[PDB]
Amino acid sequence: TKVKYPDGFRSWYHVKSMVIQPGHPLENPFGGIHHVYANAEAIQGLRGGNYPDGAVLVFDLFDYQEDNHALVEGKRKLIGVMERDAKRFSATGGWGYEGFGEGKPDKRLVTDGGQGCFGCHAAQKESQYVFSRLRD
């Protein structure tokens, strides 16, 4: 029922990054520089294959500072986590959703079984609820 903290995620495949700045509709709460990481099982799904149970995607979100026309990574605000289990997480479409405040394992953020998170990712039904595309 609970999503595992994705230990060692920092050494996974870096899928992409995006910057969300003040004025963007998702500034709350996704404002900052974010990086998406995928484990080996997730990569198979991302490649065009299907997602094996045990596939994990991580949204790693940082605050940034402006420094003379550079945006520089500040403090980690949170990690978001999607964990593939077709049977266990079938209520939110095969992915378990969890947020860890400041990336800390103890600071689980999701209180509704991940309904809130799913509600937005459900628009991406046709690509198994993942927004991120693999690039070169």
Bridge-based pairing of strands 32-38 and 56-66 is antiparallel
Residue showing tokens 């997730």: 42
Instruction: Give the interface size with a second copy as a residue count (CB under 8 A).
Output: 29
Stretch that binds a second copy, among 32-40, 51-59, 85-93, 116-124 (CB under 8 A): 32-40
Are 16 and 33 in contact, with CB atoms under 8 Å apart? no
Asked if 8 touches a second copy (CB under 8 A), the answer is: no
Are 118 and 129 in contact, with CB atoms under 8 Å apart? yes
Q: Which SS3 state, helix, strand or coil, does residue 56 take?
A: strand
Encoded amino acid at 31, one letter: G
- Applying the rule CB under 8 A, the residues between 54 and 83 that interact with a second copy are 64, 68-73, 76
User: Which residues would be at the binding site for ligand HEC (CB under 6 A)?
Assistant: 16, 18, 26, 34, 36, 57-59, 80-82, 97-99, 110, 116-117, 120-121, 130-132
User: Which residues would be at the binding site for Zn ion (CB under 5 A)?
Assistant: 23, 69
